[PDB]
Amino acid sequence: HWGYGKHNGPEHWHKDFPIAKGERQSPVDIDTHTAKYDPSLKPLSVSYDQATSLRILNNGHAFNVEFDDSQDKAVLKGGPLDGTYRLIQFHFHWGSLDGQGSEHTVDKKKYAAELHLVHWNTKYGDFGKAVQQPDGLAVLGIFLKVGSAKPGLQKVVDVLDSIKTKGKSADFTNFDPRGLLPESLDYWTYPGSLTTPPLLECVTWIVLKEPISVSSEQVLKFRKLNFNGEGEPEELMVDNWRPAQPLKNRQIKASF
Ligand SMILES: [Zn+2]
C-alpha cells in the first residue's frame, strides 16, 4: 500500500520495509567536494546498439519502459562493475515544479527529474535472484534539467496519453535508449539501494555528472499522468521521488 502521499510516502515505508533505515539506502546527496577521484575506475561501457524495447507500463508509481533481457542485447559494463549487467527497464522520478523531482542531489541541488536505467548482473541468471545480492543491480542515474527539448525523449512523451492511469500499458517497440544519454559519461559511484519498496541493498549506483536538458512541455506531459487507476479519483503523478538518505559509512567515488 506504499506511495508518495502524506499517508503512505517515504516517512512511512520503514514500517513495512525496515531496511528503509539500513546502512546503504539510496538516494544520497553527492557532496562534490567530499567525493574523491578514483584513478583506478574504468570508463563506463554503455552498449545499447541491440537494445530491444517492448512495452511501456504505468505501474501507479512511475512509468517503466521494459526491454527484452532474455539475452545480452543492451548491457552496461566497466566503470566500478565486475562482469555484465543487462538493461531490463528505465523509468523517471519527477516533481510538481521544476525546482524538485530528482532523488540524488548534487551539493543539495535538486534537478527537475531523474532517469534510472536499471540493469541486472547476468551471473545471477534472472532479475529476481540479482536483487537478493549486494552486487545484483547497476542503476545508471541521469539528471534532467528544464531547457531545450531532448529529441530522444519525445517518443516517450508522445505515448503517455495512452497510459494515463495505473495498470495501463502500450506497445513500445524500437525505442533507442542511446537518445536519452548526455555527451559525457563522467560519473559518481557508490553502493546503495532501490529507491522504492522493497528498498533492497543490491545496487551499484552510477550517477552521471552531466544532466540532459528536456523542455518544459516534455516535463509538463510527465505531470499529466495519474497515480490512480481508471475510474478512480484523479491524483496527478507528481513528486514520485524519495529524498536523500544518510550516507553512513560510505564513500562516493568520482570517475573524473
Ligand atoms: Zn528509480
From Swiss-Prot:
Effect ascribed to mutating residue 59 to H: Reduced proton transfer
Where are residues bearing Phosphoserine located in the sequence?
162, 169
Mutagenesis or variant effect for residue 61 to G: Impaired activity, not rescued by 4-methylimidazole (4-MI)
Q: What is the effect of changing residue 139 to H?
A: Impaired activity
Q: Which residues bind substrate?
A: 195-196
GO biological process terms, alphabetically, are: angiotensin-activated signaling pathway; carbon dioxide transport; morphogenesis of an epithelium; neuron cellular homeostasis; positive regulation of cellular pH reduction; positive regulation of dipeptide transmembrane transport; positive regulation of synaptic transmission, GABAergic; regulation of chloride transport
Q: What is the effect of changing residue 91 to Y?
A: In OPTB3; partial loss of activity
Where does the Alpha-carbonic anhydrase domain lie? 1-256
UniProt lists the family membership as follows: Belongs to the alpha-carbonic anhydrase family.
Q: What is this protein called?
A: Carbonic anhydrase 2
What lineage, starting at the top, does this entry show?
A: Eukaryota, Metazoa, Chordata, Craniata, Vertebrata
